Amino acid sequence: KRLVYISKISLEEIQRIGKVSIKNNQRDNITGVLLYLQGLFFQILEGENEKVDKLYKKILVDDRHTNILCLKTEYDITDRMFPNWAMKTINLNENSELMIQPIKSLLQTITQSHRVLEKYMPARVIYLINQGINPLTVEPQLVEKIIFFSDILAFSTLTEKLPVNEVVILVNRYFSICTRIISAYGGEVTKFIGDCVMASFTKEQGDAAIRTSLDIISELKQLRHHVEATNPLHLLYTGIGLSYGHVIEGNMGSSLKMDHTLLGDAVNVAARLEALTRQLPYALAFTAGVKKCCQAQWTFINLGAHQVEAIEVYTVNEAQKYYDTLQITQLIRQTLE
């Protein structure tokens, strides 16, 4: 198979890399080309399926380049594209031929624009692109997922009594903490909806979804006492709802607008449980489906049945609030006075 990917750095060393790649690829019966431009690498590799994946994993863990994204993969090609170039290194910055400068300049402009759009893509779509799968042709599937929903407590009072610059810092830190912990436990963030964070886990990650929920609550608790009382981060609380059910995962829309979405009642149920945590002594609430997806010995606490066809609500004893929810909203209210 042959693959195409772009990367990001972290000079005579890149010529040293080219010398190293020539010797290894010629030994490995693998050909291709490696380009460099303005701090970005462009490499094409081709060979037998088992051989190129062996090499692609070596460069994935390389310290020299970062932010790797496989753009394309063709598993059954008829003939190679560069049948004689073990690894042709092209330092395109050194090239000064004016006839290639337009193609050079357009390559840099689109690639830089491409690296920006990457940051807005859902993690599932980028994953599909890394696997050589076209997101516009892949059929959606019904999967058993654990839905994650979490937002900021008393966020209406915060937006009402905080400058625009302060709330942006507060939400960015909240999104950064949530995205980092969710991704660390193997979860996938779907999208941001206002101050809400939507994520999903597989049915094997039941305990990971609860550990993610507890780590997020714990990191916000650390952050609140890391800053001074004049810092908006001192008032950052969250509630977390989890649900389990059948959802349709895939890419929807038309040629004008596409999006990665999850279709199923478990999505709405997770949002209601997230809003239910305001009336509970616990900052985490999940259904029985999430509870039965857990193998670890959690101290499950039955919170009774609530209607959002009332459904059972559970939680863990570690999700207990050391504060009072209503007194915190009042504390948030009068602190901003």
Positions that interact with ligand FMN (CB under 6 A):
7, 17, 20-21, 24-25, 32, 34, 41, 43, 45, 55, 58-59, 62, 64-65, 87
DSSP per position, 63-109? SSEEEEEEEEEESS-SS-SSTT-S-EEEETTT---TTTHHHHHHHHH
Q: Which does 250 bind (CB under 5 to 8 A by kind): a copy of itself, ligand FMN, none?
A: a copy of itself
Of 15-23, 169-177, 208-216, 300-308, the segment contacting a copy of itself by CB under 8 A is: 169-177
Q: Which is nearer to ligand FMN, 55 or 328 (CB)?
A: 55
Least Å distance, CB 115 to a copy of itself, is 10
Nearer to a copy of itself, 208 or 319 (CB): 208
Among 57, 63, 75, 141, binds a copy of itself (CB under 8 A): 141
Tokens in use for 330?
A: 């009042």
Q: Does 168 bind a copy of itself (CB under 8 A)?
A: yes
Q: b/e per residue, 12-23, with b = 16+ CB within 10 A?
A: eeeeebbeebbe
CB 99: neighbour CB atoms within 10 A? 7
Q: Tokens 């908006």 sit at which residue?
A: 232
CA distance 146 to 90: 46
Residue 291 CA: distances (Å) to CA of 223, 285, 300 = 29, 10, 8
- Residue 13 or 309: the one with the smaller Cβ distance to ligand FMN is 13
Q: Which of 10, 29, 156, 330 binds a copy of itself (CB under 8 A)?
A: 156
In one letter, which amino acid is 203?
A: K
Binding to a copy of itself (CB under 8 A) within 226-265 occurs at: 246, 248, 250, 252-265
User: What's the min distance (Å) between Cβ of 327 and ligand FMN?
Assistant: 54
Query: What residues between 74 and 103 interact with a copy of itself by CB under 8 A?
Result: 81-82, 88, 90, 92, 100-103
Beta-sheet pairing, 284-286 with 238-253: parallel
Residue 308 makes contact with a copy of itself by CB under 8 A: no
The answer to whether 132 and 74 are in contact (CB under 8 A) is yes
Closest to ligand FMN by CB, 30 or 158? 30
CB of 18 to ligand FMN, least distance (A): 8
CB of 90 to ligand FMN, least distance (A): 12
Helices 164-184 and 206-224: crossing angle in degrees, nearest 10, is: 140
Q: Which of 78, 96, 165, 222 binds a copy of itself (CB under 8 A)?
A: 165
Question: Cβ 74 to ligand FMN, closest distance in Å?
Answer: 17
262-301 CB burial, b ≥16 within 10 A, e <16: bebebbebbbbbbebbeebebbbbbbebbbebbeeebeeb
